[PDB]
Design a protein around this ligand. Structure first.
Ligand SMILES: O=C(CO)[C@H](O)[C@H](O)[C@H](O)CO
Ligand SMILES: O=C(CO)[C@H](O)[C@H](O)[C@H](O)CO
Ligand SMILES: O=C(CO)[C@H](O)[C@H](O)[C@H](O)CO
Ligand SMILES: O=C(CO)[C@H](O)[C@H](O)[C@H](O)CO
Ligand SMILES: OC[C@H]1O[C@@](O)(CO)[C@H](O)[C@@H]1O
Ligand SMILES: OC[C@H]1O[C@@](O)(CO)[C@H](O)[C@@H]1O
Ligand SMILES: [Mn+2]
Ligand SMILES: [Mn+2]
Ligand SMILES: [Mn+2]
Ligand SMILES: [Mn+2]
Ligand SMILES: [Mn+2]
Ligand SMILES: [Mn+2]
Ligand SMILES: [Mn+2]
Ligand SMILES: [Mn+2]
Lengths: 417, 421, 420, 413
């Protein structure tokens, strides 16, 4: 185990190193405290949910019930320093009433409201527009089939009713994120009409007013997906236009863009025109592969672009990934800690001074300092943050994962549901 | 040379082949006549212009090549564009840059006057073409660390804002005189070579500066502005102030046009995807067809996946009437007049191939999720006789067929271009 | 229906337009009929095969769709391939996978026997086609953490090395019976989902394992091996043991064939660039034409920039005599028989367009740095009447012209596929 | 100014943090000492050289003379901890004789041999196959014009003679790197014949035997260049095949590959077959832009792939970038220090235990530990390495740059 006095010794020296270049490590840690990550429930059970029984990776101890998933999320959050949020999907409804996506009721989420209050977390929401017989040729809200459209519009309206109810009960705004798989596997003839059907369907979904204090909708675009490679009805351009036009949020999923595309470029082109962002941090490996978030160029750029340009007050940060080849609880902790330490590194910079140097076209100073900061003792500040919030330092949280494996995950498959 | 009887015989067979699948070849040719291409003047003289005799090319863009017979004067450039248009069937437009001002007066970019373009108004009337316009925001000492309108330096900003306002006054004047709306396209090099600390402030400086440029109202019948984003340029690789997102947002919110340059996007990015995401919200597009080869290289437009997708996406979804098609390339390694004709003809034959489809039936098949029929038919149409309809279009419009227009280039080299130096 | 008189008329005018620029359309069609395509059997039944009913499809590759009329028996798949080949002009080849073994004997991948392919030898002789072969290194419980031949587990290695050796023995036996060399294509899923620590040792394990597989000499007249690299697959995104560089190096050093699958490279990567960098050093290519849409998606091959560049690069530089052209794609969202015909006809018309160019003169123009003439002529040729020559080729070889073969597909749906 | 006792105290804590996970920080630093970077001379003077007077950026104080360039490289090396090498280009010949690229003599590099001895560094070499009237339609060695081919073959042979001589005089092998611009702006008809002309020409260049002890050739491919976008004669595949076939080195320039291409993937696909590598670390920003090397995914992957798989003894690491928008001396130090701290981070991992975990398919432990290691105190070990080798720590070397600007660079123009 790392010794707390080792952490304290390293922190005091780091504090002085950063003080010398005009950076306050105490203030940086206070800033990181105020950035909640919205931890996605579906990593815990491979997006099975509880509504439709049996609707990459095979690690033992998949969650199969609300209590198992709740326990798994509690365990992950206990190893993530600070205060965070959880994202639900509609299929994570908890009820003994037989339900379809178009018959869900707000009370079906009382279980998660009660859990969030106990855990001390806010809730965000996602309608479920996939893994259903009413998905017709990969289309839902914008299907050419009006019976398919009507079903999914009913689900869309219900997602808002649920989100409103949850926000009212928790006293914290629910971001209700819309992702639709709608598109074509192969080259379409008509690109226009599907997007006009989508526009009309979304306007119908958001028509009935609900208090902004309780909920607001965000719209998640995508470039391509498996079996839907050639055309995505809900493009990034369509949804940025839709969010600005209809005064809603825009969702940027870091895995959903072109090869070499830097999603950190988008923030400063959106905020002159739009309300707010839901930033889904996700690692794409050559496609929308939904790898666990790690400290890489994309995450460093996303986090430093939000910090440097002061956008955190208008950006809701969520995780989105699904890796079942590794301990599913550890996946959450890796991704959350990677996001936090990346935010903290960005906060541990003399940003005001670097901005003045850049305005003066002192590109020599900017390059030298940004490169030197990558090997400043940011780890010492991160370790101190972990310790101050009663979470294990460095390798030490593997001890907690191994204990959870012995006690829970390695036994669970043989346990009755 | 190709015998007109060969074109007529091939056309009569092609007409029947297309009629058999519910396609009217005569009607398709009538549709192609209604699509003017805006031919860019700067391919003729390697973007030298007339304002600054020996100014070096800056702003993340480069011209490679050394072919004989570069245009050096207004008369030479005008003659070269006349020769290119004589080999491009139908009626088209020409794009000017501000540096193509024709005056005996000492001008800078902030002292240009509308009458400095009387030469081009007179030429356009005699040629029977419309004019589009581009402010020149590059190759100038007042470009400071690759920035212009959005420079943090108020002196630099003010100079370039004055040029922007003048571009609108010039464009309005040309539009009034020609009785045809002048699209005034704005392209700025503004950005950073290396990674910026502040991405927000440059884009707020750009927003405020553009609003100042467009503040004074001018009749839409004479001119409307379009805004051209870029991902990266040479010496400006890491950040572009005027991004595609920024300008799509700007155009929609300020009721202006959005410029899509096919060379200015990510690897594998399909700009034909953008039209149907734009038109539920926005007014119109200026499409700059340009061939990127692994960077914004401004290669001559050829019949490739990008051009085919651009053209068929505009035809299939009925966007031609809200989309101005402009050319943008500069290849100096080849006959500069031939460069124009290759790119223009590539664009036209690609539009025509898209028009020669049973689009209403293909749309119904797709609505019924008949993806088998869609794949079979779209693939068969790629080897239908679209060339026979293209040749007939060329012949009907008094332009050479196939390889024949090379004879015209060789004669123009002999009589004009090769005599110049 | 297309009137044969329309085809004949269009062809006579096309023949003259091409003759005017020094191109012989009759000679172009003779050249095309000498290029066989190896039609992959696995498009017919969504790569189910016959060895293991209902085994889940694994190995970084997926099939989307549920169009009616899937083949479920050897006889159904054989009939479906017969129907596709009947609509593709000229004479071609078929690729088998090991899992397409036909036997009432209990078999695993390490106990397959050459005689388990007698069914396909008989079919190939009756159909009049050559056969190529692929070992099946996926969709099996012995695939351990996405690794087979180069697994760190010796038991897994030994199982897959036995399958590798058997693929060669089966291929040798087919080649002997058919009197036509079997290209035996090796594709392994081996790799990691996430970032590896050790990139060296897996590739040394692969090198050793492949050397063991090919150790026992077999007659070159009967079979030769080809090795197929990949950049990434689903669930194996971060590292592929058998990289393109590994296999080009391996093919050259061991005097085997290199397999280029057009779907298996980087964004913007032009696989037609590789031929002229390989042939100064290496023996032969197996070119797997496949359409990737933003991943190794195995879309049906269409006439696009990639296919046009592949076919014209092989034609212009005279590499066809050393290049085996195979199809690889699986699209179950459409008529599976139609999928074959679309991809095969796209490939043939693209080869033919490449052959319909004054290549000798264009090369001289290029040698003289006449880039103006090269650009004008290559662009004009894209709208020459290549379709008239293609139509003449289809008609001369007793296949429907243009949209007409849709009638055959609709008749086959009504009479066969929709009855299953 | 960072206090040495601040560095020593941070180091002692880091040493213990690393010891706890089976990593020896003293040994990691000894391994870093053994990895020389070949610093490219041409960043100092914007690739002008001295052979042909004036044939992105305009920062003041460009080197214009051998003495100026030599002094600039001395300053950069004084701020890069440990012992390194310098790469020359043929156009950096120092002679009062009238020379062309096909008439250079080994003695024309006596200036640089003498400088390298004084500085205590080895020299690598690059033939200059660009910026010359004999470049015909962007082709040199593989031009269809036999007069052009013969001119560039003479230069190629002379590059080997110069390299052998430098190698003999310094007692250190000269890696003689060959980069040719040869290719086409637009789509070629014949891709085969240019590459056969290249094969025949390279074989003529390397025909005359020279001792590997003094010099070995390396071959640098490229995907595309400005004005040469559509076809490159010397492709990566061509040169990997050529290097393996002819028993020479293969040059991997990190800036010269496809979008998303990870050049760290190539090493373990090459070394079962080939002799050695020349690794040109370079930052591409959406093209072969030759940005200064920084600590990014590419550099982290290149350096950890070399140290994890033990390829450093067969891999020569060179810098290749040109940024004239910043202090040119600072450009070298940023790139070199980025490379060194990235190598050091890779060396500060429990590589044997991680290999064991991965062999055992423990992908959970591998993800957790590799991610934790990114925020271990690698900076404390880097700062100790800098201080132990008499170079400034962190921001402090900016003082040295500012002083060199006042005293030298800002006095030139
Ligand atoms: O990115 C998404 C779809 O690819 C979605 O936001 C979530 O991952 C989805 O709701 C669950 O897979
Ligand atoms: O695309 C552009 C620059 O990249 C511009 O529209 C034109 O190229 C410029 O106005 C002239 O080069
Ligand atoms: O490309 C391949 C896998 O990615 C293989 O050649 C074939 O697709 C496989 O053998 C059948 O899926
Ligand atoms: O990569 C290169 C050219 O793009 C070369 O190695 C060097 O940059 C050249 O020798 C000097 O510019
Ligand atoms: O993991 C230990 C052994 O168990 C197995 O037999 C099955 O996992 C492996 O192949 C090893 O030999
Ligand atoms: O290690 C001492 C130096 O000696 C060498 O010059 C080799 O002779 C290396 O380049 C080092 O820089
Ligand atoms: Mn998402
Ligand atoms: Mn995703
Ligand atoms: Mn443009
Ligand atoms: Mn461009
Ligand atoms: Mn394949
Ligand atoms: Mn594939
Ligand atoms: Mn290099
Ligand atoms: Mn480079």
């Amino acid at each position: 185990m790392v010794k707390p006095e080792e952490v304290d010794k390293a922190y005091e020296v780091a504090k002085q190193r950063y003080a010398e270049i005009g950076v306050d490590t105490d203030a940086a840690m206070k800033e990181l405290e105020k950035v909640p990550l919205s931890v996605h429930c579906w990593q815990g059970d491979d997006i099975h949910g509880f509504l439709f029984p049996n609707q990459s990776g095979n690690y033992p101890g998949i969650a199969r019930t609300p209590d198992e998933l709740a326990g798994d999320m509690h365990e992950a959050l206990s190893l993530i320093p600070g205060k965070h949020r959880v994202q639900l999907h509609a299929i994570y409804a908890v009820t003994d009433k037989k339900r379809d996506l178009d018959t869900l009721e707000p009370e079906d989420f009382d279980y998660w409201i009660d859990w969030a209050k106990q855990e001390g977390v806010g809730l965000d929401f996602n309608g479920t527009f996939f893994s259903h017989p009413m998905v017709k040729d990969n289309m839902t809200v914008s299907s050419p089939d009006p019976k398919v459209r009507d079903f999914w519009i009913r689900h869309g309206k219900i997602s808002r009713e649920i989100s409103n109810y949850i926000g009212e009960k928790l006293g914290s705004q629910v971001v209700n994120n819309f992702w639709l798989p709608d598109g074509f596997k192969d080259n379409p003839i008509d690109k226009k009409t599907p997007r006009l059907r989508l526009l009309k369907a979304l306007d119908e979904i958001i028509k009935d007013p609900l208090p902004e204090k309780n909920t607001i909708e965000s719209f998640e675009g995508k470039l391509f997906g498996t079996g839907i490679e050639s055309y995505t009805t809900g493009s990034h351009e369509f949804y940025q236009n839709y969010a600005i036009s209809r005064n809603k949020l825009w969702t940027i999923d870091a895995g959903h863009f072109h090869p070499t595309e830097d999603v950190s470029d988008k923030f400063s082109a959106f905020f002159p025109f739009g309300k707010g962002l839901f930033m889904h941090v996700s690692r794409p490996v050559r496609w929308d592969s939904d790898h666990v978030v790690i400290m890489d160029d994309a995450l460093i750029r996303i986090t430093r672009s939000l910090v440097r340009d002061g956008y955190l007050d208008r950006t809701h940060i969520g995780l989105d990934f699904f890796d079942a080849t590794i301990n599913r609880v550890a996946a959450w902790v890796v991704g959350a800690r990677a996001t936090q330490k990346s935010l903290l590194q960005a906060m541990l910079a003399p940003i005001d001074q670097l901005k003045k140097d850049e305005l003066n076209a002192d590109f020599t100073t900017r390059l030298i300092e940004t490169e030197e900061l990558k090997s400043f003792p940011f780890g010492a500040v991160w370790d101190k943050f972990c310790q101050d919030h009663n979470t294990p330092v460095g390798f030490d949280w593997m001890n907690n994962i191994h204990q959870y494996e012995k006690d829970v995950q390695f036994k669970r498959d043989a346990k009755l549901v």
